[PDB]
């Protein structure tokens, strides 16, 4: 019924405070109101930017200019990656820390990179595993090094990518 | 002498001034300060201003109720004397009309005027520091000593001859 995240712009900030004019003594004088409005409306701008200072620092929306700072703390350097996929690698490596490389587990990680039906996985008798891609939205060669990391120590892997079925 | 932002007696907004000298002004004369100090004290209904529940006048007690004129006048006349710089109240014409149910009183208040104690915070200074001399006047004299003497001689020559 209520949002748990209380960090939001204050609703109707301006009309508040004006509500503290005692008994409409000054209201309708058009000389005191403008002086008060001009000062209060400055806080509006500062109040608004208080959110982006917290909202924009999250990894989901962080821009490349500062996303590097988030990656730097985790040891994931930009190298030659671009912004749209640099976000992906950060998620992939971080998610690897609570993984076991099971068949059900592997499907889950690939799920975040290719939608619901964009990926499928065949399995083979002698350590063979196969990955199929149908709806890639980013160039895969640069993402490939991580795709190896979350697999068992002895996996034998093939990678094939195509658009659609 | 209580300083504060000047309130226009005619409109109630801040007295930004005439179109030729628009700006902001402070209440300096004790008369102007006391005027607005009474105006605000009477205009704010008791309890309606947050941050101070005890300020204001309790109009709700009288308005809308059958009340005695004499009781109201006492309270009206008492709130005025809460200011520490009120000398006296001269006259009080309290009248009530039963047809329209309106009440309207008249009175005036007398207050003296004080001094400014210090001008450090307001505008100007009262001293007359000297002016440095010009050119070689200091080390060699001044010509004005000649001009004044010449003028004195001329005026004395003028005086003796009858006119």
TrEMBL record, chain A:
Name of the protein in its database record: Uncharacterized protein
TrEMBL record, chain B:
A Pfam family that the UniProt record links to this protein: Sheath_initiator
UniProt name for this protein: Uncharacterized protein
Species, as recorded: Pectobacterium phage phiTE
